Symmetry: D2
């Protein structure tokens, strides 16, 4: 009669043995979510950590790329510097060389003059010789003219 409760008690026992199997499955799925979130955010943090070292390299490459441009800078200035001096020397050389071509032609000009002056001293001596021969002949004349006039009488 009253043991109709006994059917209820096993039926009610069927829920509390069920609510437990059910709660434990939901709780083992929520636990499975917050677990995955742990494992990932871990591997994400380590991956995001790579960024600072990658930015280091980029900054160095950036710096090394600057050093390069400053070395190219130094080179242009050098070249232009040592070219300008090379040019100034080139002109001094030139100036010098034009000066030498002048003194050489002034010595060729002198060599030719020495010649006209040497030649005319030869000519001057030959003149003296010529006048010495003419003198000799003249004296041989005045001499024999005194001898011719050493006569007396007659005829």
């Amino acid at each position: 009669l009253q043991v109709i409760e006994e059917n209820n008690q096993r039926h009610k026992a069927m829920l509390d043995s069920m609510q437990e199997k059910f709660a434990t499955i939901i709780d083992s799925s929520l636990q499975s979510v917050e677990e995955h979130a742990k494992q990932m955010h871990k591997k994400l943090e380590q991956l995001g950590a790579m960024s600072l070292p990658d930015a280091e390299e980029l900054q160095n490459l950036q710096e090394e790329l600057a050093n390069e441009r400053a070395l190219a800078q130094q080179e242009d200035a050098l070249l232009e510097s040592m070219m300008m001096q090379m040019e100034q020397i080139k002109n001094l050389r030139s100036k010098n060389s034009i000066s030498m071509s002048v003194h050489l032609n002034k010595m060729e000009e002198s060599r030719l003059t020495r010649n006209h002056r040497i030649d005319d001293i030869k000519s001057g001596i030959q003149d003296y010789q010529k006048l010495g021969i003419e003198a000799s002949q003249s004296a041989q004349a005045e001499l024999t003219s005194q001898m011719e006039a050493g006569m007396l009488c007659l005829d």
Copy 2:
């Protein structure tokens, strides 16, 4: 008689008219020598005068030939100077460039690592998915096992 002196007087007159023609010829030949010596030593002095100007030119050429050697001197020093600096720049460039080849390979080394780390997060999610499917099947089981046990009597 005594006029035999008259022959002597004309004879003596023949000498003094002769000594004169003769002295005058010697004296006109000595005069002709010391005259030539005058005309020559004149042209010799002017010729010998050329020597100082010729020595001037030689001294200048000597000087200009010295300037040249000092310009060649300046050039060697210049070249060697601007070469040495060119060399130092060459090395700095090199050093820089070797440094860049290092940072580039450290970024390729990082790119490959990023990949292994990206791939395994994909693999980690597929794992989570796989475990989520296995969980779902497991729960469908424990569920229907509670339903199967909702029977009574008989059999």
Copy 3:
């Protein structure tokens, strides 16, 4: 009292039916939940896979850049060699010109020395000619006075008897 039992039977059958209606009611509801937590999982998996592909897809361009960068480094190294060879080949031409220029300056100093020596010799040979004149006009003066002797001698001596 035979009906007194059919009363208990109809309420024990009622309680069982009432109990089964909710027994089905929660099971269907629960199978909805586990089938919803799976969809919530597979959706997030799709959600993440989309972003992980988009992120992993950056690898090729990053590699493009490094490759382009790496070869541009080679360009520089080429330019270095070229510059090197240019300066070296300039250094060597400059060496030879230097020598030639040197050799040439010596040859000029030698010709200059020759002309200074030639100038010197030319002066002493001019000196000799100046000397040759003062020698000559000396013998010239001495010849005339020596002849005026022998002239005026035999004039003075030729007048009358002399010994």
Copy 4:
């Protein structure tokens, strides 16, 4: 007194002969002197001509030197041109290398900028994935508590008559 004249004749013939002997004597002697002063002249002329030839003979070597000197000046001018051309052609190669090097450094800065921009973007896409998780586990927590409601709800409600 006929002989007194032959006395004067023999002494006037004597005086004339004596006078002629010396007349020849000085003329021969004088023709020796004028013939000696000419030899003294022609000898000095030979004497000078020898020295003037030896002196004038220096002209050719002096000219040799100037010519050798003049062409050595041309050697220098050649070397100048060569050096000029060498430096000019070096200046121009150096100009091009400079440009290439320049152009190259820009291309590298561009690839670097790209990678700094690529790095930035890659971080924010990583940020989103971190965000996507905290979104997910939020919806995860909220889903569980919402289901524990509907679970414990119909357990509590499914015991006996409820409305």
